[PDB]
């Protein structure tokens, strides 16, 4: 069998985007799986297919190949290969080994936490290939956990469950990141901010504010260069993990603080508090193109306040991991904030996703992380 | 002596942009110099000013100072201070010590080439302060040249001249850049063979190895030299024989026989190389601005697209593309949009390897868009 798409679908795949939605599919199999995609008689690509979803086609090869399963597994091999260097040198670190579309492996995510891998299949065809995936990873892990409990799978028509795939999967594991260690509960920070947290180690000062600290990943690194670091978050559970990570590192200069970021910030300003550094690691504010509007204003407000709390010469590390918050808008938003706060900011560095979370230029949606460091003059 | 600006001018200085043009100035001195800027009775900033130019106000301090000259010089001191670390570690390297607006020192540029500095002023007030400028430099330099021959100086009603400010200015200097060295021409009327804002980008290219590498728009072959260390053959292309001349010279200076120059028109040569079926492991595009004005963006975009498109078509599966743009007009978003269109039209998937820009010694101010002009991107063709 094979998939047939209209001219629009063909165009998208010609321009090398990996996705073709329902509305552009003319015909195709009645069962999910791996099939060739065709525009009339013209071959376009090999892809993961699902007849019951809006996102029906996810390409992973733009070249025919006998045995589509073999080719998908080749892609897997290459993905792991790109990370061999690091897994050798830093066996105890945390790295993503498979980053879905970015690694030409749609619907599959695989992370590495100091020897223990967590697999996340999100496309129907990955479901019966897990054993193969486990067998592929095995040479580098001591465990493999199929963490297939994401709601996104229902949409595909898949079951939810977390079950070991290979070896003995620990309950929790300690991950080494630069000069600090943190705890990962393999069952329940995120690796895409790994290199940005490490960057924070180049700064020193009196006080550092870490808004939206989560498990305090940024705090941990900052505690090495500042007398005091204040990790803020709305979740007690989060700050709980933050204190625990703090203790695991023998860091007593890290102070948690349950609070609503937007309010607290206005507060530290009114009370006249000021800092040497402020990190802004907000959670996606937009759940769709619709929210962008309001999202933009939310980011501006927080960024504006953050800027107002910084001393002359202070550092601002602000970010966004939302898909709908484009890089251009992100930087426009920071600039607006800086302007309204009547403060001059020098760019210290613009960063994004690290090498293990690949970005494809032709597939915009693979780019979501924006991280920037500024100095307030 | 004060400078009065309208609400528009005030807004610009409030948002922290350093420039206020003629149209927004209500009143001010009759002679160029350093003066306070006010909106009514409200103090806004200290600034270099010129009564005879479209760009009249160039702020350098958004806080009152009793001695405008002293404050400007403190800015200079701090600019030099930010480069202290590197001047000590790499005394033989090439670094910009003062990057005009980026260092809150409008109308002043100073570069450092292994001990020899070159000063460039393009705003009136800086002229009488040149002697003090060579002073602050003295401890860090062997000599200081005053290269004041840029046409822009005429708008400011300033004389065009090239002349030493301190010490003995060499006619040529060898600069060390990582594992390579190159020649910088300080001789009057000669192009400084160095483009310091690409220093860290060239160095980056040392991480690649392969068979063939193509260096489109190689100038003095700076990128070529670094590539020569990892590829069997590097082809430096440029439309200037003079340029390729300095390229071959820099090549010999490093004992590199794997670097081959090639005088030619980039746009055509690229199309040709496709037809003869030529494919490389890595290619680099360092196009000269294609916009002498914010009105040529249109045509410029098309220009970049065509060349990028061609470059992509010449790359092997897994090849590397390092493309860039040093034009203020070609905005970052536009640049990435055009590379994307190119990749799309060429039906090739590009994985981002790294997005880069200007180095630390060429400061960018978020509130002053114009200080941002260099875009350098590395992609891998899958």
UniProtKB/Swiss-Prot annotation, chain B:
Q: Matching SUPFAM superfamilies, A to Z?
A: PUA domain-like (SSF88697), S-adenosyl-L-methionine-dependent methyltransferases (SSF53335)
Enumerate the GO terms in the molecular function aspect: methyltransferase activity; RNA binding
Q: Which domain of life is it from?
A: Bacteria
Q: Where are the transmembrane segments?
A: none
Write down the Pfam families for this protein, in alphabetical order. Methyltrans_SAM, PUA_3
Q: Name one GO cellular component term.
A: cytoplasm
Q: Where is the PUA domain?
A: 3-60
Instruction: Please write the reaction equations for the catalytic activity of this protein.
Output: cytidine(1962) in 23S rRNA + S-adenosyl-L-methionine = 5-methylcytidine(1962) in 23S rRNA + S-adenosyl-L-homocysteine + H(+)
- EC number(s) given by UniProt: 2.1.1.191
**Keyword Cytoplasm among record annotations:** yes
Keywords in UniProt for this one? Cytoplasm, Methyltransferase, S-adenosyl-L-methionine, Transferase
Which residues are S-adenosyl-L-homocysteine-binding? Answer: 202, 217, 238-239, 265-266, 286
Q: Where in the cell is it found?
A: Cytoplasm
Family classification: Belongs to the methyltransferase superfamily. RlmI family.
Function description? Specifically methylates the cytosine at position 1962 (m5C1962) of 23S rRNA.
**The protein's name in its UniProt record:** Ribosomal RNA large subunit methyltransferase I
Lineage summary: Bacteria, Thermotogati, Deinococcota, Deinococci, Thermales
């Amino acid at each position: 069998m094979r998939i047939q798409v209209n001219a629009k679908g063909a165009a998208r795949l010609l321009s090398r985007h990996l996705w073709v939605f329902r509305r552009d599919v003319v015909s195709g199999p009645e069962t999910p799986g791996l099939y060739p995609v065709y525009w009339g008689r013209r071959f376009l690509a090999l892809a993961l297919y699902n007849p019951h979803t809006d996102l029906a086609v996810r390409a992973y090869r733009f070249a025919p190949a006998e045995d589509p399963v073999a080719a998908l597994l080749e892609n897997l091999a290459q993905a792991l290969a790109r990370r061999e260097a690091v897994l050798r040198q830093d066996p105890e670190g945390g790295y993503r080994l498979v980053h879905a579309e970015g690694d030409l492996l749609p619907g599959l995510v695989v992370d590495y936490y100091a020897g223990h891998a967590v697999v996340q299949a999100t496309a129907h065809a990955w479901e019966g290939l897990l054993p193969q995936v486990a067998e592929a990873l095995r040479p580098h892990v001591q465990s493999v956990l199929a963490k297939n409990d994401a709601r996104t799978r229902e949409l595909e028509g898949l079951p939810l469950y977390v079950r070991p795939l290979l070896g003995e999967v620990p309950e929790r594991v300690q991950v080494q990141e630069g000069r600090v260690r943190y705890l990962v509960d393999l069952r329940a920070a995120y690796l895409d901010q790994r290199e940005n947290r490490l960057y924070m180690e180049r700064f020193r000062g009196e006080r550092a504010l870490d808004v939206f600290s989560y498990a305090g990943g940024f705090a941990l690194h900052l505690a090495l260069g500042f007398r005091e670091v204040v990790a803020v978050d709305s979740s007690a559970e989060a700050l709980r993990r933050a204190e625990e990570n703090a203790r695991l590192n023998g860091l007593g200069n890290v102070r948690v603080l349950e609070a609503n970021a937007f309010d607290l910030l206005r507060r530290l300003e009114k009370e006249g508090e000021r800092f040497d550094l402020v990190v802004l690691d907000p959670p996606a504010f937009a759940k769709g193109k619709k929210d962008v509007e309001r999202a933009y204003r939310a980011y501006k407000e927080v960024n504006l306040r953050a800027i107002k709390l910084l001393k002359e010469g202070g550092i601002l590390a602000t970010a966004s991991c939302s898909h709908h918050m484009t890089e251009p808008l992100f930087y426009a938003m920071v600039a607006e904030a800086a302007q309204d706060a009547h403060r001059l900011l020098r760019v210290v560095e613009k960063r994004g996703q690290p090498f293990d979370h690949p970005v494809l230029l032709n597939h915009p949606e693979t780019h979501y992380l924006k991280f920037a460091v500024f100095q307030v003059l």
